[PDB]
Write a protein that binds this ligand. Structure first.
Ligand SMILES: COC(=O)C[C@H](NC(=O)OC(C)(C)C)C(C)=O
Lengths: 141, 92
């Protein structure tokens, strides 16, 4: 048993949260080019046989209930789970269209004890977002 | 029993504390590279190995260009955070 069992009836869900336009109050420029990512991920994960679900411009609240409702689903027949977050962010934080949301609050719904039908199954979280304001000036080879 | 935090994989686009670059026309450097690597290797390589390829592609093939010197010529490295307990293959 060095490899996860991926021969279940279904590969699993692939929830893609694509936040492009943020509330004026937040002062965050639109994430132009983000639709290209959403479409890319959708095609890519469809080939891997995942049940893709794209959600666009969700508020900090909508991200939570979405994640909560998904974790409350019966994943028994599914091999794994995937969630992609496309948005603005900071260390340990992902932005809803109206404000920040802690990454921990999101991932907790899937904790081994909180989502029994996904225990022992790989839970992937692809996060495209900033994690601070530092820039890598790189170094020459 | 197993840890409740086990079997979790967090594939971050950039390292802790750093910016993550996105091209308004092609999409983010990370998502771009991830899809390409998955489309090409998901039928043979293990996930960690594919994500390592994504790491090299993003680190080598991408460099920012900006009229603002402050954001010009910047690089980026993604960050694989794995609490997985087994090898992951998108096939059987
Ligand atoms: C995932 O793409 C972005 O929205 C991340 C965003 N970074 C970002 O937009 O960098 C630029 C403005 C594209 C150079 C952030 C600071 O969180």
């Amino acid at each position: 048993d060095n490899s996860y069992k991926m021969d279940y009836p279904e590969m699993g869900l692939c929830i893609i949260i694509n936040n492009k336009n943020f509330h004026k109050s937040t002062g965050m420029t639109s994430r132009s080019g983000t639709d290209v990512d959403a479409a890319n991920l959708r095609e890519t994960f469809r080939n891997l046989k995942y049940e893709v679900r794209n959600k666009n411009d969700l508020t900090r609240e909508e991200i939570v209930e979405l994640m909560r409702d998904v974790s409350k689903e019966d994943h028994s027949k599914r091999s794994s789970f995937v969630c992609v977050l496309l948005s603005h962010g900071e260390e340990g934080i992902i932005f809803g269209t109206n404000g920040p949301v802690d990454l921990k609050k999101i991932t907790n719904f899937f904790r081994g004890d909180r989502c029994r039908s996904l225990t022992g199954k790989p839970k992937l979280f692809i996060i495209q977002a900033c994690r601070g304001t530092e820039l890598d000036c790189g170094i020459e080879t | 029993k197993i840890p409740v935090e086990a079997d979790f994989l967090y594939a971050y686009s950039t390292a802790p504390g750093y910016y993550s670059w996105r091209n308004s026309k092609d999409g983010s450097w990370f998502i771009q590279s991830l899809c390409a690597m998955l489309k090409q290797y998901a039928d043979k390589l293990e996930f960690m190995h594919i994500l390592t390829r994504v790491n090299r592609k993003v680190a080598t093939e991408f460099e920012s260009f900006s009229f603002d010197a402050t954001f010009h010529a910047k690089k980026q490295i993604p960050c694989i955070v794995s609490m997985l307990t087994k090898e992951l293959y998108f096939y059987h």
